[PDB]
Amino acid sequence: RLKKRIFAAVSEGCVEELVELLVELQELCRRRVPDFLMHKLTASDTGKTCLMKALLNINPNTKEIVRILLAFAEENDILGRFINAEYTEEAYEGQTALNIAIERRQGDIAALLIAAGADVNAHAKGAFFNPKYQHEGFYFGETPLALAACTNQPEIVQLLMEHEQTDITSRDSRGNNILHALVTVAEDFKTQNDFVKRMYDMILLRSGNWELETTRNNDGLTPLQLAAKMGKAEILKYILSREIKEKRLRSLSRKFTDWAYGPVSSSLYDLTNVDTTTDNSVLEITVYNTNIDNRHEMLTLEPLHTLLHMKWKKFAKHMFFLSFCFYFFYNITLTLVSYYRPRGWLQLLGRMFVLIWAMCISVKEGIAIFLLSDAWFHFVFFIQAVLVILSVFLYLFAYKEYLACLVLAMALGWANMLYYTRGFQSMGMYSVMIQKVILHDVLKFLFVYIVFLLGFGVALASLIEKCPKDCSSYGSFSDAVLELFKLTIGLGDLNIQQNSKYPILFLFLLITYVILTFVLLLNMLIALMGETVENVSKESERIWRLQRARTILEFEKMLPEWLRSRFRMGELCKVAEDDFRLCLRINEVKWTEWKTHVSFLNEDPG
C-alpha cells in the first residue's frame, strides 16, 4: 500500500517528512525499473500521478511537496514521463499537471513545472474540457494558454507565451485557437468585468502578426466572425475599432487615424472580412444570424453603421423604393381587378404584370422559405403571391372561386405593405410597434375574448326556448355568438326579452359577458398595450434598424456581379509599409480628449 500511502500523504501534506519516508521506501524498494517505479507512484485507473494529486489539492505546503516530488523524479531521471503525464479517463483526457496548476491559480507551481519540462502544448482533448452541455464541462480552449487567458491569469499567460515551446497558433479540436476561445468565453461586462478584451489584446500583440486573427475554426469563422456570430459586441467593437500606435505593431490594427487635426479626426477603418464581399462577413453575420438576438448593439459599431448607410444611399434606398412601387402597383392592379370584376392594351399589361410579379415573388419567397420573428413577411408575401397565381389559374378555367382567392390576395397584399414601412424611421418604428402590439397584446386578447364569446354564446343559447316564429336573437349558438360580438362592438340594440325560460339568469349571464368584455377585457387591453408601447419604444429604433439592414443586405444580394463591384463601399488606402487594404474613412469630432496626435498617414488634414 506504499502507493496509496504516498497518494494520501501527498494529497494531504501533513508534513514533508511523511512523503520523504514513503519516497525513500519506494526508492529502496523498486531498485530490487522506471516503468514500475511509476506504476508504484501512479493511479493505474485514471493515470493520475502524485504530482497531479498534489496539485489537485493545494495545501499551504504544496510548493515544497511537488518540489521534492520532481527532485526525486529527476534523481531517478524519470522527470520526462513524470511531470508530463496525462489523464487516461475519457472525460479528462490529455489533462496534464499544468492544466491543474493553472486552474487552481497556482502561478508558482506552474512556473516551477514548465521550468522543469512541463509540456505546455498539451491539449485537454476531453469531454469535460470540450463540453456539449453547460454545467458539465467548462469551455476555455483546451490548452494551458487558453485556460490561463480565460481564467484571467495574465501572469501565467505572459509566462507561457514567453516560453520558447508554447505554440500560440495551435488549434483545439473545435478548431478554435486562443482567440476564438477568448471570444467564446467572453461573456459581458456585467458577468465578466471585461478582462477578455485585455487578454485578447495582450495575446494578439504578443504574437504580432495576423496568423491568429485569420485562422478559421471548424465552423469556418475567424475570431472576428465568431465575435459577430456569438453576439459579443464588446470584443467585436474592440477588434472592429482596434488602433495600435506602436510603429512595430501598426500592421495588426483594423482602424488607423490618418489626418486628425483638432476636434475633427478622419479614421480609416479596415473592411476586409466586414463588407459582404466575402462568404459570411461581419456585417452579414451581424445583420442576419438570429441565434443570439444580441444584434442590438453590434449594428452601430463604427465601420458597420457606415457600411449600411453607404449601401442604403448608394443603391438600397432606390431598390427599396422601386420594390415598393412595384408592389404598390401590383396591389392596385389586384384591387382594381377585384373591384371591377365582371358581375384592352394597358389593361392586359397590368393583368400579366400581376401574374409575373406573383410568380417572381412566389419563387423568391419560396426559395427564401426553404432556406430557413423576422420571416413572418416571407410567409405572407409567398402566400399572397400564391393566392394571386391560384386565382389566375381558377380564372382561366371556369371557376368562380377565383374571386375568393383574389380578394384574399388583395387583402393580404395591402397587409404586406407593412413591410415597406421600414424605409422610413418614423413609419418603420411605428410598424415594429404595431407588430409587437399584435403579438404581445392583441392575440392574447383575441384568445380570451373568444373563450368568453363562445362560452357565453353557448350558455345564452342554452337558456333559450324554442318558439313556434323568430322571437329570439339568441336562438342558435351562432346567432347568440353573433350578437354577443355585436354587443361588444356596441352595434345593435339590446332586447332582454329573448324567449328565455330563466330570464333573470339570461340577464345575469348577459350582464356578466358585458362586464367581462366591456369593463374588463377591452380596458385591460388598453392598459396592456400601454405597457407594451412603452417598453417597445425603447427598442423600436434598434429593431427597425435591424429590419432595414436585413433589407439592404437582401437587395445587395439581388444585384449582379458587375453592379455589386460597381458599388463596393470603401476606397483602398495606403495603411502600412505594404498593406494597402480596403478601408472606409469616417471623420469624427471630439472635444474632451486633448492630445498631440502622432498617429496619422497624411500629416495634412483635408
Ligand X SMILES: COc1ncnc(OC)c1C(=O)Nc1nc(C(F)(F)F)c(-c2ccnc(C(C)(C)C#N)c2)s1
Ligand Y SMILES: CCCCCCCC/C=C\CCCCCCCC(=O)O[C@H](COC(=O)CCCCCCCCCCCCCCC)COP(=O)(O)OCCN
- Give residues 435-464 in contact with ligand X (rule: CB under 6 A): 438, 451-452, 455-456, 459
Q: Which of 11, 116, 109 is nearest to 71 (CA)?
A: 116
- Give residues 89-108 in contact with a second copy (rule: CB under 8 A): 89, 91-92, 103-106
> Which C-beta is closer to a second copy: that of 104 or that of 198?
104
Instruction: State phi, psi for 538 to the nearest 5 degrees.
Output: -80, -10
How near is the Cβ of 321 to ligand Y at its closest, in Å? Answer: 4
Cβ 108 vs Cβ 65: under 8 Å: no
Within 13 Å, how many C-alpha atoms sit on residue 143's CB side?
28
- Give residues 515-574 in contact with ligand X (rule: CB under 6 A): 515-516
Cβ 270 vs Cβ 221: under 8 Å: no
CA–CA gap between residue 94 and residue 157 (Å, rounded): 20
> Which C-beta is closer to a second copy: that of 33 or that of 458?
458
Give me the 562-591 binding string for a second copy, x by CB under 8 A, dash otherwise.
Answer: -xx--xxxx--x-x-----xxxxxxxxxxx
- Give residues 450-509 in contact with ligand Y (rule: CB under 6 A): 451
How near is the Cβ of 331 to ligand X at its closest, in Å? Answer: 9
Q: To 10 degrees, what angle do helices 522-536 and 443-462 make?
A: 170
Q: Taking CB within 5 to 8 Å according to partner kind, which of ligand Y, ligand X, a second copy, none is near residue 105?
A: a second copy
| Inter-CA distances, 492 with 122, 473, 484, 503, Å | 81, 11, 10, 20
Q: Taking CB within 5 to 8 Å according to partner kind, which of ligand X, a second copy, ligand Y, none is near residue 265?
A: a second copy
Q: Taking CB within 5 to 8 Å according to partner kind, which of ligand X, ligand Y, a second copy, none is near residue 412?
A: ligand X
Only segment of 33-41, 188-196, 219-227, 347-355 that touches a second copy (CB under 8 A): 188-196
CA angle 160, 165, 166 (to 5 degrees): 45
- Cell reading at 351: 393583368
> Which C-beta is closer to a second copy: that of 73 or that of 260?
260
How near is the Cβ of 341 to ligand Y at its closest, in Å? Answer: 24
- 396 torsion bin: left (phi>0), alpha (psi -120 to 50), beta (else): alpha
> Which C-beta is closer to ligand X: that of 411 or that of 576?
411
Instruction: State phi, psi for 540 to the nearest 5 degrees.
Output: -70, -35
> Which C-beta is closer to ligand Y: that of 47 or that of 455?
455
- Give residues 420-439 in contact with ligand Y (rule: CB under 6 A): 420-421, 423-424, 427, 434
- Give residues 417-446 in contact with a second copy (rule: CB under 8 A): 417, 422-423, 425, 428-434, 436-438, 442, 444-446
Decide: is 260 part of the binding site for a second copy (CB under 8 A): yes
CA angle 441, 444, 450 (to 5 degrees): 130
Q: Taking CB within 5 to 8 Å according to partner kind, which of a second copy, ligand X, ligand Y, none is near residue 321?
A: ligand Y
CA–CA gap between residue 167 and residue 199 (Å, rounded): 16
Q: Which residues of 467-494 are buried (b: 16+ CB within 10 A; e: fewer)?
A: eeeeebbbbeeebbbbbbbebbeeeeee
Candidates 461, 472, 473, 474; binder of a second copy (CB under 8 A) is 461
Give the CB-nearest residue to ligand X.
Answer: 455
Burial of 258 (0-12, 13-18, 19+ CB in 10 A): buried
Give me the 300-329 binding string for ligand Y, x by CB under 6 A, dash otherwise.
Answer: -----------------xx-xx--x-----
Decide: is 191 part of the binding site for a second copy (CB under 8 A): yes
Q: Taking CB within 5 to 8 Å according to partner kind, which of ligand X, a second copy, ligand Y, none is near residue 324?
A: ligand Y
Q: Which residues pair with 589 in a beta bridge?
A: 264
Cβ 431 vs Cβ 418: under 8 Å: yes
Q: Taking CB within 5 to 8 Å according to partner kind, which of ligand X, ligand Y, a second copy, none is near residue 346?
A: none
- Give residues 368-427 in contact with ligand X (rule: CB under 6 A): 408, 411-412, 414-415, 417-418
Q: Taking CB within 5 to 8 Å according to partner kind, which of ligand X, ligand Y, a second copy, none is near residue 396?
A: none
Give the CB-nearest residue to ligand Y.
Answer: 423
Q: State the DSSP string of 475-539.
A: SSHHHHHHHHHHHHTT-S-------BSSHHHHHHHHHHHHIIIIIIIHHHHHHHHHHHHHHHTTT
Decide: is 515 part of the binding site for ligand Y (CB under 6 A): no
> Which C-beta is closer to ligand X: that of 115 or that of 515?
515
Q: Which residues pair with 573 in a beta bridge?
A: 581
Q: Taking CB within 5 to 8 Å according to partner kind, which of ligand X, a second copy, ligand Y, none is near residue 172?
A: none
- Cell reading at 301: 459599431
- Cell reading at 176: 478554435
Cα Rg of the chain (Å, integer): 36
CA–CA gap between residue 191 and residue 432 (Å, rounded): 30
> Which C-beta is closer to ligand X: that of 102 or that of 509?
509
Candidates 220, 278, 341, 367; binder of a second copy (CB under 8 A) is 341
How near is the Cβ of 297 to a second copy at its closest, in Å? Answer: 9
Q: Which residues pair with 267 in a beta bridge?
A: 586
Q: Distance from CA of residue 329 to its chain's centroid? A: 37
Decide: is 418 part of the binding site for ligand Y (CB under 6 A): yes
Decide: is 544 part of the binding site for a second copy (CB under 8 A): yes
Only segment of 34-42, 47-55, 272-280, 417-425 that touches ligand Y (CB under 6 A): 417-425
Cβ 335 vs Cβ 328: under 8 Å: no
Residues of this chain that interact with ligand X (CB under 6 A) are 408, 411-412, 414-415, 417-418, 438, 451-452, 455-456, 459, 512, 515-516
Residues of this chain that interact with ligand Y (CB under 6 A) are 317-318, 320-321, 324, 415, 417-418, 420-421, 423-424, 427, 434, 448, 451, 516
